[PDB]
Design a protein around this ligand. Structure first.
Ligand SMILES: Nc1ncnc2c1ncn2[C@@H]1O[C@H](COP(=O)(O)OP(=O)(O)OP(=O)(O)O)[C@@H](O)[C@H]1O
Ligand SMILES: Nc1ncnc2c1ncn2[C@@H]1O[C@H](COP(=O)(O)OP(=O)(O)OP(=O)(O)O)[C@@H](O)[C@H]1O
Lengths: 668, 668
């Protein structure tokens, strides 16, 4: 096994899995019942991903229901059935629903009612934020943040012991509902990836092939991330591609098939479980089957620019804020900071209706194209002063969400960035769509409008959402698939692709890192990035760190050592492994002895010749590299193979050692 | 560079690319114009993929137009404008169109007219098949087959010198139009991947960063395969995922973005260029926005079974036929075999209207749901004898396509398998859909129909197409994305996922290889597979082949050798590389000397000390592995890193060499 905060050596896990397969095949021939058991062991992967999908579907549904209920609880309660949210009672004047101004002051409208509603909205936002931050701080500090930056590192081979446990799962679910209902600039769509990975890790223990294997566990977590995205956006294929591109790290075509199955199971559960018949794939779905004209692809591209100019700004601003908190008085007061952020968000969001709306419903509104019956300020046409006032409201919502999400992403409560960035993009896209429609029917004499309503601002809102989401995240295929799986509009894919590449390029013009890589670099997690390349001209001899300043390379001789000597080496040295060599002078790589395996073997024996025997645990095949090998090659070895150590050699004479951590330290 | 039919060592190419980048950066600081040139060199990749997308769009459009024209030429000609196909003149009784019975016999209907149409259809099928096979045999033998099995090997690092040249491109385009119009059981959708790769390879030469680099060329070919799929199915994301899953081999997240851009460019070209306003994304598009009920997912799964039972049968039957041809008299007569196949297909396909229809229009018909105005035999409702007769016709078409595609895939003309397998699946799905609809409105009293027309056979045809396509190809995410990008129905995704997984599982029950892998094993191409694992328990010492029966390991000493000695080694030995060592006794790995580089350097010098100097070409960093390393590890090294040789060592004493070909020979 592995110690806390320690990396996973992928090759050793793969080898162990191979011996397990060999032993299972040996037991298989024993009896027909053993053949059935071997078949069950084979199905284990499908069963674990199936359970993960069912759990992710159930938990996403429960979180949606609870979050909607407690979000609407900020404006009032239902008298008929208290367990119904605003919409659930509207269709179930709206006499049933009663606001807090109605319950306390007794009069629905008037300055008194507005002030009472303002005060009660702020109070409930503070209460939900307080409960979320307090529960996270007390019972599970790992439940804060979206969590994707850390599952990226966990799928890279890193280990965070309690990160995907039961306590983190429970507290993240509860505190995510609370934070969503608190009115903070965040969403649960991102955090459902963490919740799905929690379910996957929890269910891995039910199976032996995945309980004791960290590589199989990583594969199950990749499938679980796919399921989490699938259930968050109703985007099975989009979730598969998100796990392909964002979170998971290796894909030997088996993780792809099992992510396919896990996303399928999650999507099927989400379809079967429709407690109130909400056909909307998620609360911010909007159907689309209208066509678009080539000229429209010009403004779409510009939306990408905004996204690239927002993402780029966000990664430059939020990452600068989170540093200050981490290195100032602010970082000493999690609860107080969440309280102040929630209070300010409530105070400055209650006035403007768009900011008052919970972000998912705001994105639903911005995506939905105007209908003749609708007369909301968003689709309020004579045009006249009303349209300009609506555009001004949308601009204010844009500015407010930008500023607040900058200050609100990293706070210590479950906080997503898919929905705030998506809403910023949708506000941008809707403003642009309204502007283009005004231009269209005011200047219809121009050839572009003369030859080809003519334009749907909902499509522009979709494209702006994709633009900002790709600018901040830097996701291309997963993001587009997620967007048209979310919205169902598989007729606007080319516009989405144009916006997403434009946003990614404009974002990369200011720095190639996304928000999930910048909250890995900022947190100093040990993540070896594939995008980054060892541009430095260096040799493996430099990076390897048995340096002249360092002590002698800790090693073990094959037969000279005694039990007491190796036990002393275990206790007095923190190293997790030792190169087992022929002799202190021969320095011939005989194998690699793991500190945990050595300790366990010695303890079991008490409760030395590597040729107390210790050949059972000896790693006869340690990966080696020439001392003159260029370092970039070693970086590629580590990245493609996912090794933990590579024992450099010099003309066959053991020269030292390199570890993933050594490369990561050097690359800083 | 590399010799014909020789593999690509990915690490050496990657390193060379690094030195090219370093030199470009050095030149960059020279002047601002050099900064502009460096920026152009960076854009080179986007420009090459853009050109590839434009070319693929243009060529796919031209091939569609020409193939439709020549296919309809089998039934007659248009008098108004001879350059119009049947449909182009129907909307442009249909007096304009005149069949060959009309032109020759002068009678539209009657036994004489029917016999004359029979004879002329057969004659034109023979003529087109003859021209296709003859042109391929004479001018470009590489234009035969779908070609995907070979681009799979080319993207793996193999080299086939003329395979993606200009002659292969031209002849494949022409002979693909001819084969499509010949009425053979095939399609052009698959071969457009080969055509797109041809365009990508052709355009790579316009850029130096991609002309002289085989790894960059492979990346451009991955993007080109994405573009080819995108333009073949109108499925840009589907093409990106097809290149992810089927053809291309490595994805350092840059090939993903450039495949994204190439698919975007191809899709945009296909959208812009609509010469006759055919909104159908391809001639066999069908819109879908209706819902499906959970019970319908039961028959869908069964369709997958059929697909898995067809794919499985096909890989068992066709691969058995192609072997016989390759090892019997049949393989000596390409032209005669194509003639006989075309004649039999025409003779047995003219009677049944569904087989008479070109497969793309047949799939369009099977996908299209019945409309009240339509009264075709496919949607001929009173029900009565007509429905049973239509089902019988569909069964006959199913049997005929199965049998013929088995005998018709491998013949020496451009032959795809996406469309024949898709049509078999669509016939199966339509038969099942009609059966289920009859069951639905005859037995409406059952609770499944009582609670929830009620069923669309077009959706069942979609699902059956996906079932058979995944059974034969064994593609999961790419196939589903292609299907709902092709049809636009991003509301039936879960049924497609379920049918595709069922088909893949049932197919794997009879053998895990698809059709593009069984035509690599059958052709004996040097393809190292990720799905396959070295289940054999063996050590690298066994696989390495400087065996006791083999001669001494050809090696070079660093300084002792003279120019004449190394030239003699070059001429008398066919090896492409030599381990350069310290001495014939020291056997210390100093580096690796490539035969081509050695020959070129010696020739240039005439027109030795590796410490005529030859340190410029010496590979100071040859990948090495311990002689006791398990062979599974070495296989993983080769597969993940894509090396060509791994110089095994024994306690630092050079022990031998292993090559990709050595591993492939052993795995046989
Ligand atoms: N057996 C060893 N002999 C000498 N130096 C070693 C040995 N093992 C590791 N080192 C050095 O110690 C540092 C890393 O030691 P260690 O193996 O404990 O890894 P780590 O970076 O703490 O990570 P992990 O927790 O994954 O093991 C690096 O400087 C490495 O060069
Ligand atoms: N320098 C060498 N000394 C001894 N045996 C060698 C040497 N190079 C290759 N071999 C052996 O010769 C066979 C392969 O030789 P070679 O290097 O020509 O490769 P190949 O399989 O023909 O492929 P490629 O065309 O890609 O080089 C294998 O048996 C390999 O063990």
């Amino acid at each position: 096994t592995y110690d806390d905060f320690h990396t996973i050596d992928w090759v050793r896990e793969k080898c162990k899995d191979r011996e397990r397969h060999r032993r299972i095949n040996s037991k298989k021939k024993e009896s027909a019942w053993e053949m059935t058991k071997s078949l069950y062991d084979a199905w284990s992967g499908w069963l674990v991903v199936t359970l993960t999908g069912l759990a992710s579907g159930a938990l996403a549904g429960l979180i949606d229901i609870a979050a909607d209920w407690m979000t609407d609880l900020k404006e009032g309660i239902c008298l008929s059935a208290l367990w119904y949210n605003h919409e659930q009672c509207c269709w179930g004047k709206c006499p049933q629903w009663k606001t807090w101004a109605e319950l306390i002051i007794g009069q629905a409208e008037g300055p008194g009612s507005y002030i009472m509603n303002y005060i009660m909205y702020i109070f409930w936002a503070l209460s939900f934020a307080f409960l979320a931050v307090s529960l996270v701080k007390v019972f599970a500090p790992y439940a804060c943040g979206s969590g994707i930056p850390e599952i990226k590192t966990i799928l890279s081979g890193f280990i965070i012991r309690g990160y995907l446990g039961k306590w983190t799962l429970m507290i993240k679910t509860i505190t995510l509902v609370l934070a969503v209902a608190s009115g903070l600039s965040l969403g649960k769509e991102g955090p459902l990836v963490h919740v799905a990975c929690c379910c996957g890790n929890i269910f891995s223990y039910l199976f032996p092939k995945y309980s004791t294997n960290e590589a199989k566990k990583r594969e199950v977590l990749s499938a679980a991330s796919a399921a989490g995205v699938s259930v968050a956006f109703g985007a099975p294929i989009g979730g598969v591609l998100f796990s392909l591109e964002e979170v998971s790290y290796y894909f030997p075509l088996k993780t792809l098939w099992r992510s396919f199955f896990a996303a399928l199971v999650a999507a099927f559960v989400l379809r079967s479980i429709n407690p109130f018949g909400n056909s909307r794939l998620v609360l911010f779905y909007v159907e689309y089957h209208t066509p678009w004209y080539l000229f429209e692809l010009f403004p779409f591209i510009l939306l990408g620019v905004f996204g690239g100019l927002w993402g780029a700004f966000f990664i430059r601003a939020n990452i600068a804020w989170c540093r200050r908190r981490k290195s100032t008085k602010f970082g000493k007061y999690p609860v107080l900071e969440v309280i102040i952020v929630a209070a300010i968000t409530a105070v400055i969001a209650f006035p403007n209706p768009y900011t008052r709306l919970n972000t998912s419903e705001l994105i639903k509104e911005l995506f939905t194209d105007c209908g003749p019956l609708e007369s909301s300020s968003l689709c309020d046409y004579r045009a006249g002063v009303g349209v300009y006032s609506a555009i001004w409201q949308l601009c204010l919502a844009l500015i407010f969400k930008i500023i607040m999400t900058v200050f609100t992403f990293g706070i210590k409560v479950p906080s997503g960035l898919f929905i705030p960035s998506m809403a910023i993009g949708a506000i941008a896209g809707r403003i642009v769509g309204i502007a283009v429609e005004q231009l269209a029917y005011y200047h219809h004499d121009w050839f572009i409008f003369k030859e080809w309503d003519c334009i749907t601002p909902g499509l522009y809102a979709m494209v702006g959402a994709a633009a900002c989401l790709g600018g901040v995240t830097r996701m291309t295929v997963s993001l587009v698939v997620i967007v048209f799986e979310l919205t169902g509009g598989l007729e606007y894919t080319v516009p989405l692709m144009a916006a997403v590449m434009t946003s990614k390029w404009v974002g990369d013009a200011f720095g190639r890192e996304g928000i999930y890589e910048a909250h890995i670099r900022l947190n100093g997690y040990p993540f070896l990035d594939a995008k980054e390349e060892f541009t430095h001209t260096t040799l493996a001899a430099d990076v390897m760190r048995p340096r002249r300043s360092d002590p002698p390379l800790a090693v073990l001789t094959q037969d000279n050592m005694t039990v007491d000597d190796i036990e002393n080496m275990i206790n007095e040295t923190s190293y997790n492994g030792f190169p087992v060599i022929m002799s202190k002078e021969s320095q011939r790589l005989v194998g690699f002895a793991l500190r945990r395996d050595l300790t366990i073997a010695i303890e079991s024996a008490r409760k030395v010749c590597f040729a107390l025997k210790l050949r059972s645990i000896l790693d006869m095949s340690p990966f080696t590299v020439t001392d003159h090998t260029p370092m970039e090659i070693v970086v590629d070895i580590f990245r493609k193979l996912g090794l933990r150590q590579c024992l450099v050699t010099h003309n066959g004479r053991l020269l030292g050692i390199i570890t993933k951590k050594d490369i990561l330290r050097h690359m800083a």
